[PDB]
């Protein structure tokens, strides 16, 4: 719609603000991966649980390289 | 009997070591107050045997 | 959203591999998420904000700590995310202190 395109503007801004926050803290992730984690957090999630996954899945894919 | 000597001593030792680590732990959680531990092993022998096993999340 | 397939989208991004090929690694991911889905603490995005300021101040990158004070407002401004605490709680956990390299891409 139009008010549904105003919401897509409202999220493309936020995903970009969190990317500037992503690079000043030097995370290994980029805009696509970051776009998943906001959707998880909207439902409510444990970031103590999420961070242990990401340090594992990024650590165990250079054995398939 | 060593079912009346050594077994009882080991049972007491289990319970006593458990209570001793409990007491040292219950001071270490908050933060001289640490001087009670510092005196008791002045050599630093058994200075800390719990390395704090981890938990999920 | 429905979080069981949403975590499956996530493993398609980190891994470059097919999720129909490898599924053992995705099983370890469901192991940790669905045992503790809720955090062990309450919401305070204020306490986590004053440690990201405290992170850039101790490096003496003080121009970027005032840029960050402007980025922290914008997350409240839109309000399309219910827990703005968790997204910052997540980004602090994935951080590193490089002790080099300050640059900008804002605006």
Curated annotation (Swiss-Prot), chain A:
Stretches of the chain forming a coiled coil according to its record: none
Domain of life of the native organism: Eukaryota
Compartments (UniProt record): Cytoplasm, Cytoskeleton, Microtubule organizing center, Centrosome; Cytoplasm, Cytoskeleton, Spindle
Record carries keyword Acetylation: yes
Family: Belongs to the MOZART1 family.
Function, as annotated: Required for the recruitment and the assembly of the gamma-tubulin ring complex (gTuRC) at the centrosome. The gTuRC regulates the minus-end nucleation of alpha-beta tubulin heterodimers that grow into microtubule protafilaments, a critical step in centrosome duplication and spindle formation.
Protein name stated in the entry: Mitotic-spindle organizing protein 1
Swiss-Prot record, chain B:
Segment of the intact protein contained: 814 to 876 of 902
Role: Component of the gamma-tubulin ring complex (gTuRC) which mediates microtubule nucleation. The gTuRC regulates the minus-end nucleation of alpha-beta tubulin heterodimers that grow into microtubule protafilaments, a critical step in centrosome duplication and spindle formation. Plays a role in neuronal migration.
Species: Homo sapiens (Human)
Family: Belongs to the TUBGCP family.
Protein name: Gamma-tubulin complex component 2
Tissue: Ubiquitously expressed.
Gene it is expressed from: TUBGCP2
Localization (cell): Cytoplasm, Cytoskeleton, Microtubule organizing center, Centrosome
Subunit description: Component of the gamma-tubulin ring complex (gTuRC) consisting of TUBGCP2, TUBGCP3, TUBGCP4, TUBGCP5 and TUBGCP6 and gamma-tubulin TUBG1 or TUBG2. TUBGCP2, TUBGCP3, TUBGCP4, TUBGCP5 and TUBGCP6 assemble in a 5:5:2:1:1 stoichiometry; each is associated with a gamma-tubulin, thereby arranging 14 gamma-tubulins in a helical manner. Gamma-tubulin at the first position is blocked by TUBGCP3 at the last position, allowing 13 protafilaments to grow into a microtubule.
Pathological condition linked to this protein in its record: Cortical dysplasia, complex, with other brain malformations 15: An autosomal recessive disorder characterized by global developmental delay, variably impaired intellectual development, speech delay, facial dysmorphism, microcephaly, and varying degrees of cortical malformations including pachygyria, thin corpus callosum and subcortical band heterotopia. Most patients have generalized seizures.
UniProtKB/Swiss-Prot annotation, chain C:
Record-stated family: Belongs to the TUBGCP family.
Localization in the cell: Cytoplasm, Cytoskeleton, Microtubule organizing center, Centrosome
Role summary: Component of the gamma-tubulin ring complex (gTuRC) which mediates microtubule nucleation. The gTuRC regulates the minus-end nucleation of alpha-beta tubulin heterodimers that grow into microtubule protafilaments, a critical step in centrosome duplication and spindle formation.
Tissue expression as described in the entry: Ubiquitously expressed.
UniProt subunit comment: Component of the gamma-tubulin ring complex (gTuRC) consisting of TUBGCP2, TUBGCP3, TUBGCP4, TUBGCP5 and TUBGCP6 and gamma-tubulin TUBG1 or TUBG2. TUBGCP2, TUBGCP3, TUBGCP4, TUBGCP5 and TUBGCP6 assemble in a 5:5:2:1:1 stoichiometry; each is associated with a gamma-tubulin, thereby arranging 14 gamma-tubulins in a helical manner. Gamma-tubulin at the first position is blocked by TUBGCP3 at the last position, allowing 13 protafilaments to grow into a microtubule.
Identification of the protein by name: Gamma-tubulin complex component 3
Residues carrying Phosphoserine: 107
